[PDB]
């Protein structure tokens, strides 16, 4: 008989409309589930994970950390295939984040059957990591919550520039590309956009994108795909951030295209390790920043030092 208020989410597929204060919350993709621990909820169910880390943990440190602190326990959908249907409609959720999230309309679609959707805003994966904490709270009807704890976040990132001076000066206003370089193949590689999260993040810490991104921002993805023959393009950038191994660096800097780039030769490349933790924290969640974000601005620190 009572009918509480609805919470109305806008989305890239229409809108949501559930009631006030759901339960039972499962999240998928990556790093919806930092959010809702973040707040101090356990999830029913989430996404597994296999990048910095392996399939058979399926958890990352700052994510199990934040789990056990609950007391909770971790409950994996065996979805690194794909969304996984069947597990997530046997976590009888009461709502599924997907704020961050690449589901298609038919995903969305056959989702929403489950439970309501906090589907991403417009594209998929271009959802900044301060709004997947607006989307995924306010679905769970915690938008204040989730404000603050964007604030707190935000004082995290703060309060650790703080503590590094001389990082925190090397790193102001350097203009950087955040890209995945494959040294087994370098006839092309992908630069992310200020829409990737990632690249975003960079921002936070106090870096800028250099004028060469805004040829490369108006396709709608959160990546482009450039041939090393274009690579000069992107001679304005101080310094560029890459995955990799300890042979990355070496091997781009031989390059007979990718070498003569200015920060490749200058040797003012980030090379972030492979799959590992660090390498997944690139992509912040409000957990991973915490985590992560010390190790972060050294080896940035350390890239850009190399910048002329």
Not at 54 to 82: C, H, M, Q, R, Y
Not at 121 to 148: C, F, H, N, V, Y
Not at 242 to 262: C, S
């Amino acid at each position: 008989e009572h009918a509480p208020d609805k919470i109305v989410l806008d989305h890239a597929f229409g809108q949501t409309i559930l009631d006030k204060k759901p339960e039972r919350v499962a999240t998928i993709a990556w790093g919806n589930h930092d959010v809702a621990l973040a707040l101090g909820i356990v999830p029913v169910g989430f996404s597994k994970a296999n990048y910095g880390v392996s399939a058979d943990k399926g958890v990352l440190p700052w994510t199990e950390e934040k789990i056990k602190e609950l007391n909770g326990k971790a409950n994996l959908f065996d979805d690194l295939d794909g969304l996984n249907f069947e597990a997530i409609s046997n976590s009888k959720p009461d709502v599924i984040l997907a704020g961050y999230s690449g589901i298609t309309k038919e995903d969305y679609d056959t989702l929403s059957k489950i439970a309501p959707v906090a589907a991403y805003k417009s594209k998929p994966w271009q959802t900044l990591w301060r709004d997947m904490i607006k989307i995924d709270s306010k679905a769970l009807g915690m938008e204040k919550e989730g404000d603050e704890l964007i604030k707190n976040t935000e004082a995290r990132i703060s309060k650790e520039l703080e503590k590094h001076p001389e990082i925190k000066g090397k790193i102001k206003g350097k203009k950087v590309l955040f890209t995945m370089i494959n040294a087994a193949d370098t006839s092309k590689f992908w630069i992310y956009t200020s829409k990737d999260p990632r690249a975003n993040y960079l921002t936070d810490l106090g870096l800028v994108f250099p004028e060469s991104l805004k040829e490369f921002e108006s396709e709608d993805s959160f990546a482009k795909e450039i041939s090393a023959e274009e690579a000069n393009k992107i001679n304005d950038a101080d310094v560029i951030i890459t995955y990799g191994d300890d042979k990355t660096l070496e091997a781009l800097q031989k390059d007979p295209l990718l070498g003569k780039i200015n920060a490749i030769k200058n040797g003012a490349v980030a090379v972030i390790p492979d799959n590992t933790p660090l390498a997944a924290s690139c992509t912040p969640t409000p957990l991973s920043i915490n985590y992560t974000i010390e190790e972060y601005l050294n080896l940035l620190g350390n890239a850009c030092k190399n910048a002329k």
